[PDB]
């Protein structure tokens, strides 16, 4: 009943089948296009059911308020960018393309489902679609030992964390009589208890694996090195957005809006994440590993974002996450476009690139600088709005600490610019001596860099968006 | 509370059927020659002795079929209550289950073309 | 204080002892083939435990999928990777175990402290025998999205394993 | 009890004790995953010494030996 | 392109079923013909 | 005549704790089904042994007893009397446990075959689905027999036993789903009380599906690859000498008998001289009971006969020609049959 | 036969699965423990279904989806293990340490 909130998802689902069928018949087709078309059609279908109708529930198993619209459109854009990146990156390796985009769209459908769910079974199944698709994409290039090792380790860890989440969900069904819903669960048990806290903590363990928070982080660095790069580019953004949507829609709504100790636990995890990622990425040599620990720190900034729920911390998370999408996808487009041509190597080989390819230098420089909180750039506005919200409620240590760790993270964000710009032709590396100098990647990089360089001052149109979105969450 | 009515024979019959092998086999040791252990223990490689090393040269020729079997065998468990409730359900659950079956058939065609 | 509730009790404790012993056999035994067969034994004993709890369809399904299909898959994958198990020990081979043990043990106690502290809602009503028609109704009334979406889950898993174990 | 698989071609023995009629014959065969690269056929399990028995045996004395070469048809050789 | 494949498929199936039923009828015909067995110890055979 | 009632009441007349009385009626049918199972094994062995001689202008055993009636008696008593040998590096626990694992569930699945209404053990609401489940345990015993033997010759042919048994359970399931449509459930009594005047006429395709998937349970010379005597001697069985080989032998024939009885109850019915019976009273109940038992055994015998008669009509298939039946002829056709029956029950709910 | 000891038995399987998950030397021997954990959660769900929420069983369905996804995930895991066996030619999980 009421499949209208479902249209987008099944629309994408349709093309999944299609992108296999044309891939099963032809074996060499033009499937990179019209996947973009259906994702655009989905994001277009989002507007008629954004605010024109009121929020409604499918059968009580799925609600499509503005928050779900936000997260679904976000994950769709992440998949779109990752496709535009991965077309000529996976073709460079001796591997297929149809199964790849099939699995990527499947993860996307899972993450677009989990952002609008309020029932335990369906949460688990969507979570497992996205998780298993990630387990595959991590190891899709099984010619290398490290890719397969990362896929194995990520699969096993995620299976264990999912089983813990599943135990906790079982308890939360147990407690309050039947109730596998979420608005009815945090409805028949409304008081502190031991078992409710155990269920809380196990669900925190299940979610932190998704949002890369520490100590639940050990998969991100190894996996982001080993895995395919555009896979990582979708993985970080989309898995995080699904994880945070799950965190809100579970902890706030289905779970309990009573036992608010989880705020304390997220303060602990955010403190540790800031102190760990931005400090330990400072001692690295690879880009992908650096971006992993960066992603951890950025997650910490978000986690202080939504630990202060006052109708602005949540909004700040949402905006900063929208903005981190653009920023991180741009950085990954640049490292793709560098690793393809000649380099295929680590940080020290970027030196002297400003003479050969200035466009890539502009792109990656602006993206890395925005990640560190540099003025006019979108990440700066995201971080200052996080600080505004988290300071308004009364968290004082978190704001100072996140500011300080941003001041620390600018160092390893600027090392890359020292390479790409400052290093003179007497200090090029061997990779850049023989640098030569695809189309969808370039247009994606431009569409991304102009966004992260202009969507900080053009912010009112998409602060009204987010504050319209977050009327719905309890507080 | 136990509402299954139709058991209390499954248990005892699991017991008696787990007791026929151990008892027909225990009624053999009581009357049979003992062991003869020197060279009757060797391994049948058609009269000749085994070569040595003794490996198998493993292959996916029997793994992949178990994989797709796990898939299509998990699938059937979603179909028994469908068939059994098809009286009560009627239409809009046949339309809604041929989707399941069609996506299954797409998986089947994928495995078939390879 | 009865014969019909006594058989349930004796069968339950026998099956539980079998489960625990066979799981410890899965985890402690050095040889892994014995562990796989004992894992199948665990699956059968749990399928027999479900029948005491008025779940027969899911019991037959556990006997049909896990022991029937997954356990066979493990018994293939295990001889795929047997090379006489030539493993030299590490100095901390005991240390890790101890850590795991105390950690694991704590969790058990912690969970037990919950299970005996919280006032469950026993809901004294006779359950329903028809535990298969009802699941059919729930696949198309309440839990329809997981049905429709586990469809594509299974598709994607097939597409993945078929192209991750392929020999090339 | 087990056999310790490895990524190498497998050698198997189709020994003298065939479950068939096609004489007694070895076929030490090496395979690559239910294939066949080659095989050493170790025939020789039925050499009893005709060609040196036929030097102390005149024609009429030797002619019953002769019908044991082709056990199926003992007149293409008589 | 696709319909012809299904027709050839069904044709192979039908021809296989027919060539199996042929041997079926043959063996079911052999089980009325008298046994040519020589029940030796009671039905010995006379040498030449 | 409700023999349960009189057995309990006459036994409740001299006391004996009426609950205990209901407890003490359990083993009677539970062993009666073992009796008819063992008898069906003896009959199947003798039948194959004489009909495989009729096909060839041969005469089977006639010096054992009158007509070979005591031939499997001799076989079984011998195999008791034979030595058992445990080869060099083989495991001691798994070796003498493989055959038990592959033999037990086939007996345990005799808790559903009717032979007559209220003349069975404990009609389960699950019924045939439990058979489809328990039949999937045999490959574990086969792989056990393969691993628990230093004979690479065995393990090389025990894996292909867990390649066909793991291949002809899906269409075997779909063909019985097609029956679960019609019959309001899965119990055998409900599959068959739907016939009051048969499913074969309305399942003309699923008959072939079920019947090819049942013959191909590592049973018969159309496939029976894991005992391919000519390809590789007795596969996994060649190190099993005494009563263990008898367990394997027993298991094959008793599974064949179960398949025949189960085709009978599914598609034809263990009752129903094809006129609408019960149109024409203890002395009448004891008559229709015998009539239903007899007709059940008639149809089961016809299927045993056809099964053994394919063994001597149909040369085997390697392994690729085999597994191109599953997933290429039985599974697509089973899906088509399921969808067809579903659509017809949606359109024409009458008659189903 | 009571809910309490069913929960305790499931928690004991959970404990044992963690012990096998940390103690494992092989890499195929970890999925076994994971499956034990999933079995334990199924056991809890079925207990809750019998005692707490009976007239409309709702945990049995969730256990069906659990055994489904667990079978699929074990499939994918063994597929990955078959691939790492191609390169490293072992499953000694303490040899997969590509970081210092």
TrEMBL record, chain C:
> How does this chain sit within the bilayer?
Multi-pass membrane protein
Q: Where are the transmembrane segments?
A: 6-29, 36-53, 59-82, 94-116, 143-165
Q: What does this protein do?
A: NDH-1 shuttles electrons from NADH, via FMN and iron-sulfur (Fe-S) centers, to quinones in the respiratory chain. Couples the redox reaction to proton translocation (for every two electrons transferred, four hydrogen ions are translocated across the cytoplasmic membrane), and thus conserves the redox energy in a proton gradient.
Transcription regulation among the record's keywords? no
Q: This protein is called what?
A: NADH-quinone oxidoreductase subunit J
Q: What is its main location?
A: membrane
Substrates-to-products reaction catalysed: a plastoquinone + NADH + (n+1) H(+)(in) = a plastoquinol + NAD(+) + n H(+)(out); a plastoquinone + NADPH + (n+1) H(+)(in) = a plastoquinol + NADP(+) + n H(+)(out)
Its GO CC terms are: plasma membrane; transmembrane transporter complex
- The source's superkingdom equals Bacteria
Q: Which residues form the signal peptide?
A: none
Q: What does the UniProt entry say about where the protein is found?
A: Cell membrane
A single Gene Ontology MF term assigned here is:
NADH dehydrogenase (ubiquinone) activity
- Keyword entries, A-Z: Cell membrane, Membrane, NAD, Quinone, Transmembrane, Transmembrane helix
Homology family: Belongs to the complex I subunit 6 family.
Organism listed in the record: Thermosynechococcus vestitus (strain NIES-2133 / IAM M-273 / BP-1)
Query: Which residues of the complete protein appear here?
Result: 1 to 168 of 200
Enzyme Commission code(s) on record: 7.1.1.-
Record's keyword annotation contains Transcription: no
From TrEMBL, chain G:
Instruction: Write out the transmembrane intervals.
Output: 6-23, 30-49, 61-85
Q: Which family does it belong to?
A: Belongs to the complex I subunit 4L family.
Q: Quaternary state and partners of this protein?
A: NDH-1 can be composed of about 15 different subunits; different subcomplexes with different compositions have been identified which probably have different functions.
Q: Tell me the name of the encoding gene.
A: ndhE
Localisation per UniProt entry: Cellular thylakoid membrane; Membrane
The answer on whether this UniProt entry bears the keyword Transmembrane helix reads: yes
GO biological process annotation, one example: photosynthesis, light reaction
In short, the EC number is: 7.1.1.-
InterPro entries listed in its UniProt record:
NADH_UbQ_OxRdtase_chain4L/K (IPR001133), NUOK/Mnh_C1-like (IPR039428)
The organism is Thermosynechococcus vestitus (strain NIES-2133 / IAM M-273 / BP-1)
Lineage of the organism: Bacteria, Bacillati, Cyanobacteriota, Cyanophyceae, Acaryochloridales
What name does this protein carry? NAD(P)H-quinone oxidoreductase subunit 4L
Which NCBIfam families is this protein grouped with?
A: PRK05715.1-2, PRK05715.1-3, PRK05715.1-4, PRK05715.1-5
Is-annotated flag, keyword Secreted?
no
Query: Sorted alphabetically, which PANTHER family does this protein's record hold?
Result: NADH-UBIQUINONE OXIDOREDUCTASE CHAIN 4L (PTHR11434:SF16), NADH-UBIQUINONE OXIDOREDUCTASE SUBUNIT ND4L (PTHR11434)
């Amino acid at each position: 009943g009421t499949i209208l909130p479902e249209t987008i998802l099944i629309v994408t689902l349709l093309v999944v089948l299609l992108a296999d069928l044309i891939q099963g018949r032809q074996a060499d087709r033009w499937t990179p296009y019209f996947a973009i078309v259906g994702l655009g059609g989905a994001i277009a279908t989002m507007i008629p059911l954004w605010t024109q109708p009121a929020t409604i529930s499918f059968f009580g198993s799925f609600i499509s308020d503005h928050l779900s619209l936000f997260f679904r459109g976000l994950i769709a854009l992440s998949a779109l960018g990752t496709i535009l990146m991965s077309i000529r990156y996976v073709e460079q390796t001796g591997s297929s393309l149809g199964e790849f985009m099939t699995i990527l769209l499947t993860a996307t459908v899972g993450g677009m489902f989990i952002a609008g769910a309020q029932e335990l079974v369906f949460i688990f199944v969507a979570l497992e679609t996205l998780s298993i698709a990630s387990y595959l994409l991590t190891g899709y290039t099984k010619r290398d030992s490290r890719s397969n090792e990362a896929a194995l380790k990520y699969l096993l860890i995620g299976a264990a964390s999912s089983a813990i989440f599943l135990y906790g969900s079982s308890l939360l069904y147990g407690l309050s009589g039947g109730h596998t819903q979420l608005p009815a669960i945090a409805q028949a048990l409304s008081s502190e208890s031991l078992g409710l806290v155990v269920a809380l903590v196990f669900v925190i363990a299940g979610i932190s694996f998704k949002i890369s928070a520490v100590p639940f982080h050990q998969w991100t660095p190894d996996v982001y090195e080993g895995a395919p790069t555009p896979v990582v580019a979708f993985l970080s953004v989309g898995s995080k957005a699904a994880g945070f949507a799950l965190a809100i829609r579970f902890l706030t709504l289905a779970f309990p809006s009573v036992t608010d100790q989880w705020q304390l636990i997220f303060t602990v995890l955010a403190i540790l994440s800031m102190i760990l990622g931005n400090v330990v990425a400072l001692a690295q040599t690879s880009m992908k590993r650096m971006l992993a620990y960066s992603s951890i720190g950025q997650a910490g900034f978000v986690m202080i974002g939504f630990v202060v729920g006052t109708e602005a911390g949540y909004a700040s998370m949402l905006f900063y996450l929208l903005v981190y999408l653009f920023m991180n996808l741009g950085a990954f487009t640049c490292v793709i476009l560098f690793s393809l041509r000649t380099g295929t190597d680590q940080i020290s080989e970027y030196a002297g690139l400003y003479q050969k390819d200035p466009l890539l230098t502009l792109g990656l420089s602006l993206c890395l600088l925005s990640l560190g909180g540099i003025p006019p750039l979108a990440g700066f506005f995201g971080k200052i709005y996080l600080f505004w919200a988290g300071w308004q409620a009364g968290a004082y240590g978190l704001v100072l600490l996140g500011l300080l760790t941003s001041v620390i993270s600018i160092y390893y964000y600027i090392r890359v610019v020292k390479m790409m710009v400052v290093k003179e032709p007497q200090e090029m590396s061997e990779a850049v001596r023989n640098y030569p100098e695809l189309r969808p990647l370039q247009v994606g990089l431009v569409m991304t860099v102009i966004a992260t360089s202009l969507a900080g001052i053009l912010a009112n149109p998409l602060f009204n968006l987010v504050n319209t979105a977050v009327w719905d969450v309890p507080q | 509370v136990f509402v299954l009515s139709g058991y209390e024979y499954f248990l005892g019959f699991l017991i008696i059927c787990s007791l026929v092998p151990v008892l027909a086999l225990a009624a053999s040791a009581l009357l049979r020659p003992k062991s003869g252990r020197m060279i009757r223990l060797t391994t049948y490689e058609s009269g000749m002795e085994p070569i040595g090393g003794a490996w198998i040269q493993f292959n996916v020729r029997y793994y992949m079929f178990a994989l797709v079997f796990v898939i299509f065998d998990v699938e059937t468990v979603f179909l028994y209550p469908w068939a059994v409730a098809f009286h009560q359900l009627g239409l809009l659950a046949f339309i809604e289950a041929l989707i399941f079956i069609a996506i299954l058939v797409v998986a089947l065609v994928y495995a078939w073309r390879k | 204080m009865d014969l019909a509730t006594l058989t349930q009790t004796i069968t339950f404790f026998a099956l539980a002892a079998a489960v625990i012993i066979a799981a410890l056999g899965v985890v402690l035994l050095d040889n892994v083939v014995y562990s796989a067969f004992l894992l199948g034994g665990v699956f059968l004993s749990i399928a027999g435990l479900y029948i005491l709890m008025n779940a027969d369809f899911v019991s037959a399904a556990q006997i049909l999928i896990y022991v029937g299909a997954v356990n066979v898959l493990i018994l293939f994958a295990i001889m795929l990777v047997n090379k006489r198990e030539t493993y030299t020990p590490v100095p901390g081979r005991w240390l890790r175990q101890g850590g795991a043990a105390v950690v694991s043990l704590g969790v058990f106690a912690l969970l037990t402290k919950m299970i005996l502290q919280t006032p469950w809602q026993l809901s004294s009503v006779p359950p329903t025998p028809d535990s298969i028609t009802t699941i059919g109704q729930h696949f198309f009334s309440d839990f329809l999205l997981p049905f429709e979406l586990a469809s594509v889950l299974l598709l994607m898993a097939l597409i993945g394993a078929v192209v991750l174990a392929r020999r090339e | 009890p087990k056999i310790e698989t490895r990524t190498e071609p497998m050698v198997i023995n189709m020994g003298p004790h065939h479950p068939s009629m096609h004489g007694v014959l070895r076929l030490m065969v090496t395979l690559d995953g239910e294939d066949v690269i080659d095989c050493e056929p170790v025939i020789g399990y039925l050499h009893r010494g005709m060609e040196k028995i036929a030097e102390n045996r005149t024609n009429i004395m030797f002619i019953p030996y002769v019908s044991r070469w082709d056990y199926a048809a003992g007149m293409f050789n008589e | 392109k696709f319909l012809n494949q299904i027709t050839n498929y069904a044709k192979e199936a039908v021809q296989s079923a027919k060539y199996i039923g042929q041997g079926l009828s043959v063996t079911f015909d052999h089980m009325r013909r008298r046994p040519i067995t020589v029940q030796y110890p009671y039905e010995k055979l006379i040498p030449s | 005549i409700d023999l349960q009632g009189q057995f309990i009441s006459a036994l409740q007349s001299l006391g004996l704790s009426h609950d205990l009385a209901k407890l003490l009626w359990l083993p009677l049918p539970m062993l009666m089904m073992l009796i008819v199972a063992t008898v069906g094994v003896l009959v199947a062995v003798w039948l194959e042994r004489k009909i495989s001689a009729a096909v060839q202008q041969r005469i089977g055993p006639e010096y054992i007893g009158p007509l070979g009636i005591l031939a499997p008696l001799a076989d079984g008593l011998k195999l008791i009397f034979k030595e058992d040998v445990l080869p060099a590096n083989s495991d001691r626990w798994l070796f003498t446990l493989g055959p038990a694992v592959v033999v037990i569930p086939v007996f345990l699945s005799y808790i559903i075959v009717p032979f007559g209404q209220n003349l069975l053990i404990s009609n389960l609401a699950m019924g045939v689905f439990l058979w489809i489940a328990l039949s999937s345990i045999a490959p574990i015993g086969l792989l056990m027999a393969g691993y628990a033997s230093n004979n690479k010759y065995s393990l090389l042919g025990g894996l292909r036993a867990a390649a066909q048994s793991i291949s002809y359970e899906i269409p075997l399931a779909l063909a019985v789903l097609a029956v679960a449509m019609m019959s309001n459930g899965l119990g055998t009594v409900e599959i068959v009380e739907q016939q009051s005047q048969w499913n074969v006429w309305r399942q003309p395709i699923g008959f072939l599906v079920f019947w090819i998937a049942a013959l191909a349970e590592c049973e018969r010379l159309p496939f029976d690859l894991p005992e391919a005597e000519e390809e590789l001697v007795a596969g996994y069985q060649t190190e099993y000498a005494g009563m263990k080989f008898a367990l394997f032998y027993l298991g094959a024939y008793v599974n064949l008998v179960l398949s025949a009885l189960l085709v009978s109850v599914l598609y034809f019915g263990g009752w129903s001289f094809p006129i609408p019976l019960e149109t024409i009273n203890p002395f009448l109940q004891i008559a229709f009971a015998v009539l239903g038992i007899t007709m059940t055994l008639i149809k089961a015998y016809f299927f045993v006969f056809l099964a053994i008669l394919l063994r001597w009509t149909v040369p085997r298939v390697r392994i690729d020609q085999l597994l191109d039946l599953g997933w290429k002829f039985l599974l697509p056709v089973g899906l088509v049959n399921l969808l067809l029956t579903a659509g017809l029950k949606l359109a024409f709910p009458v008659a189903f | 036969m009571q809910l309490t000891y069913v929960l305790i038995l499931a928690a004991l399987l959970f404990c044992i699965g963690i012990y096998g998950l940390v103690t494992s030397r092989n890499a195929v021997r970890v999925l076994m423990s994971i499956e034990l954990l999933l079995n334990a959660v199924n056991l809890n769900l079925i207990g809750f279904a019998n005692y707490l929420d009976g007239q409309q069983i709702k945990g049995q369905v969730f256990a069906v989806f659990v055994i489904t996804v667990a079978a699929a995930e074990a499939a994918v895991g063994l597929a990955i293990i078959l691939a790492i066996y191609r390169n490293r030619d072992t499953v000694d999980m303490e040899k997969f340490n590509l970081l210092k």
